[PDB]
Write a protein that binds this ligand. Sequence first.
Ligand SMILES: CC(C)(Oc1ccc(C(=O)c2ccc(Cl)cc2)cc1)C(=O)O
Ligand SMILES: *c1ccc([N+](=O)[O-])cc1C(=O)Nc1ccccc1
Ligand SMILES: *c1ccc([N+](=O)[O-])cc1C(=O)Nc1ccccc1
Ligand SMILES: *c1ccc([N+](=O)[O-])cc1C(=O)Nc1ccccc1
Length: 269
Amino acid sequence: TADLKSLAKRIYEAYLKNFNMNKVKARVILSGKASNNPPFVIHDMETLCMAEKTLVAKLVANGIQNKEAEVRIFHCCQCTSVETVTELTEFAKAIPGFANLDLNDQVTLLKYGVYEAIFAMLSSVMNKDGMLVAYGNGFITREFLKSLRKPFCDIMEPKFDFAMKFNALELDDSDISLFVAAIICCGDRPGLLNVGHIEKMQEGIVHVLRLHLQSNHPDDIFLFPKLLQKMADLRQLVTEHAQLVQIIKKTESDAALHPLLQEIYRDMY
Ligand SMILES: CC(C)(Oc1ccc(C(=O)c2ccc(Cl)cc2)cc1)C(=O)O
Ligand SMILES: *c1ccc([N+](=O)[O-])cc1C(=O)Nc1ccccc1
Ligand SMILES: *c1ccc([N+](=O)[O-])cc1C(=O)Nc1ccccc1
Ligand SMILES: *c1ccc([N+](=O)[O-])cc1C(=O)Nc1ccccc1
């Protein structure tokens, strides 16, 4: 079309603008074809404490430091998502009609959707062996994550499984931008007031996405349906994650939950 392609572009531009780590900037680091200075590999406890030597500032004033090895990892890992939530909250502005929604419906969308988008985008920085960290400056291996003591070794491995099959779709930021937009405009979230209004808004994004996918990836005929399954998959992935988070709350007495994330997880699933 033309007006649609403008909207699809308006979304993409908001994607690159807000999220500092896109799939292009990431796949080039993992390829190592643009530089000979690879990110610092974190594969065991020694390499971890080395890299942590860089953040000794944020670690001392936060009281972690002497905390357990796993707690330290996923303590800063929370600060990441808190940032991605903010970037996502701003990315939602560009969505046509979103800013107009009732302030309650806006928060509800961003409540049940953020983590579904975080894990989706989180695939862009993963591979079969690990993921990028610190805006591409670090690469934490996948086996080291599976080596932590339970239940921390069950946190990231599920996401790696999704990112491997999801990456297999060969998507570019051009598409993910729209894909993440549709995730936020899901009219299925509990507590939505104007269900009719939101569904109209989502159908616009999905319609744009369905044509964009057929245009940018014409050979993968059922690519659009596959992604719909992925949305369903992510919805399930975030649910299990929420259960595993609350499981860490009812047992681990030395792992505190970030204030912002508390409100998100509160009575989520
Ligand atoms: C992906 C990530 C960081 O996943 C978590 C993994 C571990 C924790 C915790 O260590 C923790 C701390 C306090 C409580 Cl009450 C429960 C769990 C939190 C989130 C997220 O969700 O952004
Ligand atoms: C998260 C957990 C642990 C560390 N660390 O001790 O090396 C770092 C991070 C992290 O995400 N650091 C970061 C984020 C963004 C930009 C630069 C560095
Ligand atoms: C945790 C959640 C999300 C990201 N991310 O996609 O930027 C990274 C991490 C993480 O584990 N960061 C990290 C960096 C350095 C040392 C430990 C942990
Ligand atoms: C955010 C970024 C980096 C670190 N760190 O490596 O010390 C910590 C945090 C952070 O906000 N931790 C936290 C968890 C729970 C409640 C408040 C703060």
